[PDB]
């Protein structure tokens, strides 16, 4: 699709905000990454840029990229963005501030394209794993092993399953906003917005203050270029401060929700589950860390816990009423006993 929820698209407009670490003396780049979410366990990561790529703010094409340079957009191709995490990602779809991308897992996320007088890249921390939700935990994107139940992302961008605060935005600097009132620096709107203000010099800065500007300060770089977008409510980033005198309502959804089904997944290479006489001999040979653990079945209790991330023949003494064997977030298996070494006389010879 291109159009999935004009909830986000129409009612949001890009903005440019500071990147938390960029190492160009800490560049400002419109790819300022907040909310990395490798919270789908299926190879896929949702990333948030501070700019609203997707549809420009209109009806046409996920294949554009509209960030702010100035107070103005810069409506160019989607593919001029480069999300990456470890190895280069492959886009799945963009919607709003949010992109879904097939990426390697990563402790960080590292996005970047040339913009400004620099190379304008952006990086941020967020712990990602494509862990099974259970007694296993995994790294790399699926390419092996059995499927078993964990999170996975929606390819659907209409989701009202959660919503992120976007109600009354505020500033980011865009001193392209800030014109001059013929000696003193003058607040202006990006494309509409109730834009609040102050300078180092005295000015009113509580209430709506789009009709107030500072009449005592000349320097542009000591004043509050604002975007309270109250008709195109933008993502509320940490690198986008809020107003304090205004209130608008415009809480706006997130397109991509990690949902649980049969995620494309992993299963740590096949364990040998064999029952001998009241004993599960278990040759084990995993890849990703598997918590093997048990539930000795019957009147019995006897659990065992040991993370197995190393090949080990272990044993679990199966009782008459059974033992259970829980090779990670692979579903619990079960074993009864009375033996399984074969041959307890308890009959009458005649054969």
């Amino acid at each position: 699709d291109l159009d999935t929820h004009f909830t986000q698209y129409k009612l949001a407009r890009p903005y440019i905000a500071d990147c938390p670490n960029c190492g160009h003396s800490r560049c400002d780049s419109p790819i300022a990454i907040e909310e990395v979410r490798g919270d789908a366990h299926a190879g896929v990561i949702r990333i948030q840029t501070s700019a609203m790529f997707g549809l420009k703010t209109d009806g046409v094409d996920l294949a554009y990229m509209s960030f702010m340079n100035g107070k103005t957009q810069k409506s160019i191709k989607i593919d001029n963005l480069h999300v990456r995490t470890s190895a280069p990602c492959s886009l799945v779809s963009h919607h709003g501030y949010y992109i879904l991308a097939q990426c390697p897992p990563g402790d960080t996320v590292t996005v970047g394209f040339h913009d400004g007088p620099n190379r304008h890249t952006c990086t941020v921390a967020h712990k990602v794993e494509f862990r099974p939700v259970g007694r296993e935990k995994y790294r790399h994107p699926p390419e092996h092993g059995v499927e078993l139940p964990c999170n996975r992302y929606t390819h659907k961008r209409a989701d009202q399953g959660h919503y992120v605060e976007m109600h009354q935005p505020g500033l980011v600097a865009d001193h392209s906003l800030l014109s001059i009132h013929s000696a003193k620096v003058k607040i202006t709107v990006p494309s509409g917005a109730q834009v609040k203000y102050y300078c180092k010099c005295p000015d009113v800065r509580e209430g709506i203050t789009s009709s107030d500007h500072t009449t005592t300060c000349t320097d542009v770089k000591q004043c509050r270029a604002y975007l309270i977008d109250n008709k195109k409510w933008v993502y509320n980033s940490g690198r986008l401060p809020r107003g304090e005198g205004d209130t608008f309502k415009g809480k706006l959804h997130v397109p991509f929700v990690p949902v649980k089904a049969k995620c494309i997944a992993t299963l740590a290479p096949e364990p040998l589950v064999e029952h001998k006489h009241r004993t599960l001999i278990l040759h084990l040979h995993p890849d990703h860390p598997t918590l093997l653990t048990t539930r000795s079945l019957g009147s019995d209790a006897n659990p065992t816990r040991q993370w197995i991330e190393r090949p080990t023949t272990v044993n679990f003494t199966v009782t008459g009423e059974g033992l259970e064997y829980t090779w990670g977030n692979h579903p619990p298996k079960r074993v009864w006993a009375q033996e399984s070494g074969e041959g307890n006389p308890h009959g009458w010879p005649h054969e």
Partner: protein
């Protein structure tokens, strides 16, 4: 007659019980205490789930008398920082020399995973108590029916009139207050919802996945954004979710006594392998097989001609019975101490006739109370291997 039967409340075991009687013929049952049911009244106190620092946008008052105010979705962690003269594309937006402060605010807010597949606390009230009990019969073939144990229906459901419980799993093996996160159950106590405890379970405490009121501190500590430019550092400890599958506490679907594994539950521990449901049935005499329409078994002998044995289902032993009467014959090793493949097998007088059963033995010397009169039904047979397989089909264990 009125066939009491208690067995471990073990999900996957057909214990194939026997009504011992001499008025009418003994008749088989299967008192199979299938699936551990527990289910009391509960209260959702708060969802927990790994954070997402979904910043509400920092309320910034840069100079003079600071305010971080209040906007919808209360509870905001907010900390002034100085040594900044910010940038975000253009110049500084905090800039006075009376302060020079840029006030960053970040709260913990529910992740998208909070909505779906999430840790979920409960303060669980004493409430109701439930059981699930199969009763088969040496006439009737199966019914595995949910049965209450509290004030609502601890009487008849399916065949016979059956009085159920109290269970030994009337409460879960886990604590009164219980967290559940997927399959994995984490027992954690807290008194009731309010403002929780950070860096432990209930460090996020949102009443539900999308909410206004919450407790927003997963050990969320804002720090100074160095280099005179502003972003918002989130220093955060793992939540009760991240802990609970890879920084896990106690995974109760693998460490809850009995034999339990669990799903998403209010406070129920599915699949427990004890939790014993003491079943007692008031069986009308009509439902039986008559003792004269069964052999009143006499001249009991068990032998084989050829045999192969199976401890799941398929264990056989021919029987040389030359009984006083003849008829149909429900069989079972008295009171769920065998698994019988059959409900009822006919047995007459004169000759030899195999029946099927299964027991916790490798050759068939399990007593069998064949519609009156027990006998250990030996026969050479052949050892099976069939014990790699799940919850018993060899009763509560009592033979080889």
């Amino acid at each position: 007659y009125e066939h009491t039967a208690v067995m471990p409340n073990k999900v996957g075991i057909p214990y194939k019980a026997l009504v011992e009687r001499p008025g009418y013929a003994p008749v088989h049952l299967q008192i199979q205490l299938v699936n551990t049911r527990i289910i009391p009244s509960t209260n959702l106190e708060y969802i927990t789930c790994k954070y997402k620092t979904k910043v509400p946008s920092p309320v910034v008052k840069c100079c003079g008398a600071t305010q971080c105010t209040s906007k919808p979705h209360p509870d905001y962690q907010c900390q002034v920082f100085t040594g900044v003269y910010p940038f975000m594309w253009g110049g500084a937006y905090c800039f006075c020399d009376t302060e020079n402060t840029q006030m960053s605010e970040a709260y913990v807010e529910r992740s998208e995973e909070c909505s779906i597949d999430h840790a979920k606390a409960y303060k669980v009230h004493t409430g109701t108590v439930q059981a699930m009990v199969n009763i088969t019969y040496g006439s009737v073939s199966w019914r595995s029916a949910d049965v209450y144990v509290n004030g609502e229906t601890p009487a008849k459901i399916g065949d016979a009139k059956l009085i159920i419980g109290p269970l030994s799993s009337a409460w879960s093996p886990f604590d009164n207050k219980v967290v559940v996160y997927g399959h994995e159950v984490y027992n954690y106590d807290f008194p009731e919802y309010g403002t929780g405890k950070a860096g432990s379970f209930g460090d996020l405490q949102s009443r539900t996945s999308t909410s206004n009121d919450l407790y927003a501190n997963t050990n969320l500590k804002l720090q100074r954004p160095q280099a005179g430019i502003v972003h918002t550092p989130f220093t955060q400890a793992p939540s009760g979710f991240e802990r609970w599958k890879r920084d896990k506490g106690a995974p109760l679907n693998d460490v809850a006594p009995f034999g339990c594994s669990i799903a998403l539950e209010p406070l129920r521990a599915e699949n427990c392998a004890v939790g014993s449901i003491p079943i007692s049935i008031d069986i009308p005499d009509a439902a039986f097989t008559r003792i004269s329409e069964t052999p009143t078994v006499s001249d009991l002998e068990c032998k084989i001609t050829e045999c192969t044995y199976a401890s799941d289902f398929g264990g056989i032993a021919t029987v040389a019975y030359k009984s006083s009467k003849a008829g149909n014959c429900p069989i079972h090793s008295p009171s769920g101490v065998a698994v019988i493949k059959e409900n009822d097998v006919t047995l007459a007088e004169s000759g030899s006739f195999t029946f099927h059963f299964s027991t916790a033995n490798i050759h068939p010397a399990f007593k069998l109370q064949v519609c009156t009169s027990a006998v250990t039904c030996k026969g050479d047979c052949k050892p099976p291997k069939d014990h790699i397989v799940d919850y018993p089909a060899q009763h509560t264990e009592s033979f080889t």
